[PDB]
Design a binder for this molecule. Structure first.
Ligand SMILES: [Cl-]
Lengths: 6, 418
């Protein structure tokens, strides 16, 4: 699974 | 051999297509890694986070996920995570004019949206155990760029996103503000499936080291963070000044191109001003340069041997424009054609055709600039851009681009009458 970065 | 399959999100922080092709942080990095391996890079895009992970743990799936992921645990062993390549920090975002929530419990009674399946959702779920009064929503049909738009224009009160994402985007959302940090600095990491052969993983981590020593991870974080695509409208005073101070150096160049390409020289000049404020020395970390801000690929393809030479830049950029406009579907007529040509100059023909398809399907007229102009901003919304071929694109900046060229164009036309 969970986890929206870049 | 092939062919490294890399799954990501279609989004401005990760991977997206622009006027010159594929691009984005996660893309460059994963392509610089595929190069190291000796293989061809194959990008796959996930419908959303829940899908990304699912596709990654599946028997016949991709090799790794590169998508700004915040690692979850060193257990689970299902999905294992690389070394970290970027330190970010979750922040609450609010709108200017509403009250800044100071610390967590201030979140109760506010419409909150987060990406479904995200670490930010786990963050709020955790908080909800403290305060059951907490209410928040999660969607699959938004990306962070949507969330920020939603806060900006006031459709939701708060949101929760990693510091970097706000860094790349805050500039396009004049209204949003960071309330507070929420968590400590987490490192971003790639996700590979678990987990019984560590050869691919060990090569990943060796590449992310040395990339952190040779230092192109700091090269990237500055190449993709904190610039504006389309420069804002400068107003009459500034424009009038440059009209007297700058245009006379380059006016014979503009005029001579317009002759050679049977077009209004002033529209060309307008483009030059929107691109560099008529500065031949101008440049961007994006890779455009010169009075008409041209890429290397383009300048070489228009016969431009020195991008810093204004006469050549003005020739090449004008050549590019007229060519793009000759190339439009001949069902688009003038003047609209020229506005489309501007739009394409900026956003690329490809996205522009998506906007035309969307326009038509949405009941409008794909040959009227005033209609497609309205489809263009929807390319920055997942609910819409995912239904398209080429995906995300900050098309509202394309709109500001075209508006701005046209308004310089109008002033120029007026000062050069009758
Ligand atoms: Cl025109």
């Amino acid at each position: 699974x969970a986890x929206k970065x870049x | 051999e092939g062919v490294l399959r890399v799954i990501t999100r279609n989004s401005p922080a990760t991977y997206f297509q622009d006027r010159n092709g594929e691009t984005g942080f996660e893309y460059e990095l994963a392509k610089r890694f595929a190069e190291r391996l000796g293989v061809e890079l194959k990008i796959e895009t996930a419908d959303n986070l829940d899908d990304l992970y699912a596709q990654l743990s599946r028997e016949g799936g991709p090799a790794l996920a590169a998508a700004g992921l915040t690692p979850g645990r060193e257990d689970d062993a299902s999905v294992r995570y690389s070394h970290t390549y970027l330190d970010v920090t979750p922040q609450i975002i609010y709108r200017n004019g509403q009250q800044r929530p100071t610390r967590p419990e201030d979140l109760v009674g506010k419409r909150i949206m987060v990406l479904k399946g995200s670490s930010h959702a786990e963050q709020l779920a955790e908080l909800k155990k403290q305060y059951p009064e907490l209410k928040y929503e999660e969607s699959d049909a938004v990306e962070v760029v949507d969330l920020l738009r939603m806060v900006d224009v006031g459709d939701i009160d708060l949101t929760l996103v990693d510091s970097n994402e706000l860094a790349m985007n805050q500039v396009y959302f004049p209204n949003v503000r960071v309330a507070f940090d929420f968590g400590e600095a987490r490192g971003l990491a790639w996700a590979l499936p678990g987990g019984d052969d560590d050869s691919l993983m060990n090569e990943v981590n060796a590449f992310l080291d040395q990339a952190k020593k040779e230092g192109l991870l700091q090269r990237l974080k500055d190449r993709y963070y904190g610039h504006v695509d389309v420069l804002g409208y400068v107003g009459a005073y500034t424009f009038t000044q440059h009209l007297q101070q700058r245009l006379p150096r380059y006016e014979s160049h503009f005029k001579q191109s317009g002759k050679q390409k049977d077009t209004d020289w002033r529209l060309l000049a307008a483009i030059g001003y929107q691109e560099s404020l008529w500065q031949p020395g101008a440049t961007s970390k994006t890779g455009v340069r010169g009075l008409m801000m041209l890429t290397n690929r383009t300048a070489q393809a228009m016969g431009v041997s020195n991008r810093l030479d204004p006469k050549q830049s003005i020739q090449g950029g004008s050549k590019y424009f007229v060519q793009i406009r000759s190339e439009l579907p001949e069902s688009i007529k003038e003047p609209d054609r020229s506005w489309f040509a501007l739009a394409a100059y900026n956003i690329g023909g490809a996205h522009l055709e998506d906007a035309r398809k969307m326009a038509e399907k949405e009941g409008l007229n794909p040959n009227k600039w005033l209609d497609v102009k309205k489809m263009l901003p929807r390319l920055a919304q997942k609910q819409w851009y995912a239904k398209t071929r080429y995906g995300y694109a900050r098309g509202g900046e394309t709109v500001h681009f075209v508006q701005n060229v046209r308004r310089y164009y109008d002033i120029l036309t007026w000062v050069t009458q009758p």
